[PDB]
Ligand binder design. Structure first.
Ligand SMILES: O=c1ccn([C@@H]2O[C@H](COP(=O)(O)OP(=O)(O)OP(=O)(O)O)[C@@H](O)[C@H]2O)c(=O)[nH]1
Ligand SMILES: O=c1ccn([C@@H]2O[C@H](COP(=O)(O)OP(=O)(O)OP(=O)(O)O)[C@@H](O)[C@H]2O)c(=O)[nH]1
Ligand SMILES: O=c1ccn([C@@H]2O[C@H](COP(=O)(O)OP(=O)(O)OP(=O)(O)O)[C@@H](O)[C@H]2O)c(=O)[nH]1
Ligand SMILES: O=c1ccn([C@@H]2O[C@H](COP(=O)(O)OP(=O)(O)OP(=O)(O)O)[C@@H](O)[C@H]2O)c(=O)[nH]1
Ligand SMILES: O=c1ccn([C@@H]2O[C@H](COP(=O)(O)OP(=O)(O)OP(=O)(O)O)[C@@H](O)[C@H]2O)c(=O)[nH]1
Ligand SMILES: O=c1ccn([C@@H]2O[C@H](COP(=O)(O)OP(=O)(O)OP(=O)(O)O)[C@@H](O)[C@H]2O)c(=O)[nH]1
Lengths: 236, 236, 236, 236, 236, 236
């Protein structure tokens, strides 16, 4: 009798979380991703997914090596388009209707269009938003919040490799602990790592709730949507 | 003792930008490539470059993992655009006029246009050609021979990590010897591995000469262009 | 009780076969074409058609007259887009759902897109692929085999003006005879005229059967699809 | 005795490229046109060219055959792009800077852009304008007067196979005489055939002078531009 | 029992009539517009609407101030795209399927395409045509007649701020009177203000009836469509 | 006494082109702006311009009226393109090379391209950047700081109708005084209104200096660029 507690969601997929040991993409994690997204679609949930590129390139990182920061961000963005393309295909092969859209118009997929996106969602099609915001100096987390506000999602689900928001990187600091609930205020006064002010403040400004969970946990995405104890919730 | 080629078509394998890790791009090797191409431009030579994507993706390889071959080939092509973009930036940072063109419209960079290409070339601007031929079921080798014939290059220079064409792999067999010259017919007869059959065949029909050389041996590119003994030549 | 022996086909239409006495297009042959394609659509067959331009321009021919070979191929390609447009219209007027796609993005029709093409076919829409492969130095026969492999056709039906594959041009050599069956091997050891190695080898490589028939024969296309004795079959 | 026009708009009828066969393009006449335009460019004159498609297709003609008029007009326009492409190549082969622009985006050639056009013109590059006005129910004559007014040409030179404007067809009536000058009003009053009414009317309202001359009479184009007695002038 | 007397109409909306006191747009007039268009859609009528830009910019007017006439027309056109976008949104918010198309390809809406437009109309979607004809020196009235003939409307409904065609501007001349019926002949011999010959003659040429009514009159559009006494009818 | 900035980013508020009426564009102020920018170009300074759209539309303002915020922001952006087009024409009419680029592909003008921008700038061509950042929920101020950082401008010059930054509005309070210099920290601490928080914050992180000055005070722009006491500087 459960029933989902969300009608339209914006699922931000970390690029790094498509690696799963060794750079590149992990086909089996991609296929699991599809199956889990398939379930949401059937449950009637409208899904829009913003995907990152950290498993291939990060602009700032390339900038340290000497490259022009803008060109570095452009490669980072093309990296998100490569993930989006792999994700879409995994979706099609799992018999799920999906469309890839790119912030920077390319031709291989559609160009992002607001009205078109809303139409696709109302029609139960999964919409994959690539190239983030289309601009350099930004991160895909920003795009998740922007697109999330544009398509009017009920919430942004940040898929990560950790169970929630920790006080410090749980993989490097042995003192790291995660909270299960936070307000946009607490996040700043405690200075916990969630996103980057740019993205965050935008979400706060527009009162868009955020739920941080672990995508490496099979079933976690479904628990979040069904309203079961998973991850951390950031509200006002 | 001036150069022997007015216009060439440099074909770099995606692995050419790989560091010691065996994947991605290595800033220092990129910058080194840019200096070597800078010298050719100053020498009066017109340069067109076709770069691969093996340091990132291969369609056949992805298809084995379950993915749709065509989508795998699109990601491969897209990777060659990531390389072309990094190569262009190294060029601009070394003060060399260069323009990235793509066989797949990506209005990042502009689209490949034969007429525009010939114009950029006549103006001493290095033309970088990404996305191979624009179609799946093809390799960047074929794009090198194709573009090479379109822009009327004097020769296709195939960059490898070996000094030339051997009787067998010299690293997996110390008996192997390097040919100083060959005809398309002998390559096929002796079952020699130079490049993709489709591509090779194309170059043979249009009598486009091929020079296989070592891009890691300092001075090689210049020597190959100065008519000095270096690598293997292939004609007929 | 017949029932078609093919579910998805790639129909390669020769440009020359739309002339029918006197250059240009033959409206009545175009309308018959539509009616016959209409029948396949109703039978449930998914049709993708690659159309040539030989009735208007051929690149190599223009090259002999002195023109730049690449520009010549570009005109040849625009010629296929003109035929595709006429074909599409004949289809619409016969109340058949059809979409025109061009290898070289134009705007008047759609730009070729793999995923989009598959969706249109699954939806029983006729897909007309123009501008061949998008590249010069190639022929539309190449494109028929490439697109045929891309959309995963069960077979490529080469529509011609002769009943099959002959030993020599039946219109010029009085010794010309046609075979009714051939393997990709036989085709080469006998050196019979079918396509051009480029195209052919590709088809062979991917084990795509080919059936050569005469489109000037009213009903021939329907016989081929129903599995009746028509034309020549090339298999491995 | 320098030229009398700084910038002109040469309007070539599609038939201007037709050989003796009465269809298509004749390489030798094309090359001859290129030499005559080369001379004008050297003389300091800025040249814009609008070419028709009657040596290939006409929308009204196709519509009579059953086809949708709009589609017929698209094919007609597309033919003017085939001519513009061949004319551009003859130009480049005669060493004349020229760029083909299209009223129908064909990202082959680039799109018509008024500002870019004026810039190319000021840079002594022959601008070739294809696809007429971009809309059906119009002729390339109207595009000649329209573009002529946009680029602020000093005059529209209408190339015909006759010496000028006659009282009646001189080939179907030996009584006919050639006017050396006329006003838009007299043309309409005497029911004289100069061009499409829509087009004519447009030129009259913007006071764009028209010179009708013979493109086959050697030296004519130069004479018309050197203020020497040649053809018919039309103003008011 | 009424029943509409038209199946497909082309509704030309004056840009000025979206102001309603004070430049800019009048949201409440826009919402009424939507409701009235909603009714037509439900009645089964296929609606195509051409919208002007006179409430923001007029090319000729900008030309007097000193600006380049062509650039002035380009701004006028962008003005029609801004109105089209506002109109579309008002339509979506009233739960009416609508698509915006632009004569000059932009990316934010679709690019105008004939076949696509017809498909959208057959599917009961409202089609908004912006950027008029795409060319300078023309008015949106021209585009209304051109698009009207293209999509094969049964009639063009010119929405204005006056009840019909008057002898003189009813707001400035106290002698102004309107006729209730006119032939294309009468319109010229009486020289009444309806459109501009360009547009008009085109409509006449193609025998497209025109009905001029007042959109500020709530219900007037519905009366016209139902065949009730409203506005002025221009026929041959 | 040469200029103190090699490359600047001039940000003009849409209201900067407004006449006394309080809406639209005033030809004379436009021409005056062009003369002031002409002088900078002659002085060797590279100029990038980001113009707003408040003299026409604001998304938030439209959203209050009932419209979809995103669509309101698209119309706003589109208005900045109307201004950019008028500003470009005034520039060309004053004989200043200038190119309009848009963050929203409008193939009127070409699309924004970082690399192309840097090239135009190095060539002494004024680059006009329209459509802000390309995304809704942003202001042109943010686009000024963003583009300013991308093109590596030496400073962002914020044109206002006031002499600089005051303690309070000087027109609504005669006690207000003008700061001659400030740090990002003091602006935020003293609750000073300089620009959009999002934008400001961005400029602070990249240490992009901001100069607020009066665009109506003749000579101001030149003085600001000649290192002479004028307006308010903001750095840290
Ligand atoms: O709006 C955007 C989004 C992305 N990008 C560029 O794409 C690159 C991809 O970086 P992402 O931020 O997409 O990486 P990711 O999601 O995998 O990383 P985490 O969430 O785990 O931190 C970024 O480093 C940036 O340079 C932009 O330039 N603009
Ligand atoms: O025309 C093209 C070119 C390339 N590709 C796609 O790019 C992928 C990378 O293949 P490449 O041919 O780009 O590899 P590479 O140059 O780095 O490697 P070498 O052959 O030099 O050893 C291919 O596996 C394919 O998926 C296309 O599908 N089409
Ligand atoms: O991939 C392609 C396809 C076509 N083309 C160009 O289009 C032209 C049209 O030539 P086609 O090969 O399309 O002609 P056709 O089908 O009518 O001829 P047959 O099958 O009967 O032999 C060719 O001559 C070539 O120049 C390309 O450049 N590339
Ligand atoms: O604006 C345009 C121009 C041309 N066309 C299309 O191009 C076709 C060719 O008509 P053209 O007007 O191009 O013919 P032409 O110049 O060769 O012939 P003359 O008038 O000089 O005798 C026309 O019949 C129409 O279908 C358009 O529809 N729109
Ligand atoms: O085909 C076209 C249409 C429109 N435009 C340009 O758009 C501008 C908008 O002018 P319109 O003619 O669209 O204005 P309107 O409809 O509001 O005015 P009325 O019907 O009440 O007279 C025109 O002034 C012109 O410069 C073109 O350049 N070409
Ligand atoms: O990135 C952008 C820029 C602008 N806009 C849209 O443009 C509208 C106009 O807002 P602007 O920010 O262009 O206004 P302006 O410069 O004239 O005004 P000041 O801030 O200088 O006082 C905004 O209200 C928004 O709708 C975007 O949505 N995105």
């Amino acid at each position: 009798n459960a029933k989902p507690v969300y009608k339209r969601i914006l699922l931000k997929l970390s690029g790094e979380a498509l690696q799963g040991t060794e750079f590149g993409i992990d086909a089996s994690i991609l296929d699991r991703m599809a199956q889990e997204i398939k379930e949401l679609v059937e449950l009637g949930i409208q899904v829009g997914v913003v995907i990152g590129g950290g498993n291939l390139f990060r602009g700032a990182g390339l900038a340290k090596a000497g490259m022009n920061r803008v060109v570095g961000d452009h490669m980072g963005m093309l990296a998100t388009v490569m993930n989006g393309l792999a994700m879409r295909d995994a979706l099609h092969r799992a018999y799920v209707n999906a469309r890839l859209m790119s912030a920077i118009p390319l031709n291989v997929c559609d160009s992002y269009s607001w009205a078109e996106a809303i139409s696709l969602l109302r029609n139960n099609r999964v919409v994959i938003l690539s190239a983030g915001t289309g601009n350099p100096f930004f991160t895909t987390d920003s795009a998740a919040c922007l697109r999330g506000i544009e398509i009017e999602a009920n919430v942004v689900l940040k898929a990560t490799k950790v169970d929630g928001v920790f006080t410090a990187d749980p993989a490097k600091d042995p003192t790291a602990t995660m909270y299960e609930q936070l307000t946009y205020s607490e996040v700043l006064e405690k200075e916990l790592k969630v996103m980057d002010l740019a993205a965050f403040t935008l979400a706060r400004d527009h009162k868009l709730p955020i739920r941080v969970f672990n995508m490496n946990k099979p079933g976690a995405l479904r628990r979040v949507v069904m309203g079961e104890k998973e991850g951390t919730l950031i509200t006002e």
